[PDB]
């Protein structure tokens, strides 16, 4: 694959779930969606899998939150692993405002 990050632009109010639709396919990829993992402050944070602790319940809190609320910033690198692709792809997340 490519070891250089691919660049994508998002609005800070966009959810991690929206990223999934945007990434490859929107409708056909709804449960098929790749998993994005990011390193945040030297610790590895999984953004697709529920590595986020949530109050009460929240079935999918990580997906429900925005990229901004997830602690993502412009220039942040994301490592995505996909089911349709046997490769890990690196992305740079760029926020538009």
From Swiss-Prot:
Phenotype upon changing residue 55 to A: Impairs NEDD8 transfer to UBE2M
Effect of residue 58 to A: No effect on NEDD8 transfer to UBE2M
Tissues expressing the protein: Ubiquitously expressed.
Substitution effect: residue 49 to A: Impairs NEDD8 transfer to UBE2M
The keyword Mitochondrion is assigned to this record: no
Keywords: Acetylation, ATP-binding, Cell cycle, Ligase, Nucleotide-binding, Ubl conjugation pathway
Consequence when changing residue 46 to A: Impairs NEDD8 transfer to UBE2M
Keyword Acetylation applies: yes
A single GO cellular-component term on record: cytoplasm
Annotated spans, Interaction with UBE2M core domain: 3-97
Gene Ontology biological process terms, A to Z: endomitotic cell cycle; post-translational protein modification; protein modification process; protein neddylation; proteolysis; regulation of cell cycle
Subunit structure: Heterodimer of UBA3 and NAE1. Interacts with NEDD8, UBE2F and UBE2M. Binds ESR1 and ESR2 with bound steroid ligand. Interacts with TBATA.
Family label: Belongs to the ubiquitin-activating E1 family. UBA3 subfamily.
Protein name: NEDD8-activating enzyme E1 catalytic subunit
Complete-protein stretch covered: 369 to 463 of 463
């Amino acid at each position: 694959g490519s070891q250089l990050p691919q660049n994508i632009q998002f609005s800070p109010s966009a959810k991690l779930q929206e990223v999934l639709d945007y990434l490859t396919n929107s409708a056909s990829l709804q449960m098929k969606s790749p998993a994005i993992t990011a390193t945040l402050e030297g610790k590895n944070r999984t953004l697709y899998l529920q590595s986020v602790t949530s109050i009460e319940e929240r079935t999918r809190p990580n997906l429900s939150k925005t990229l901004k609320e997830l602690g993502l910033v412009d220039g942040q690198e994301l490592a995505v692993a996909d089911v349709t692709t046997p490769q890990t792809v690196l992305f740079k997340l760029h926020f538009t405002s």
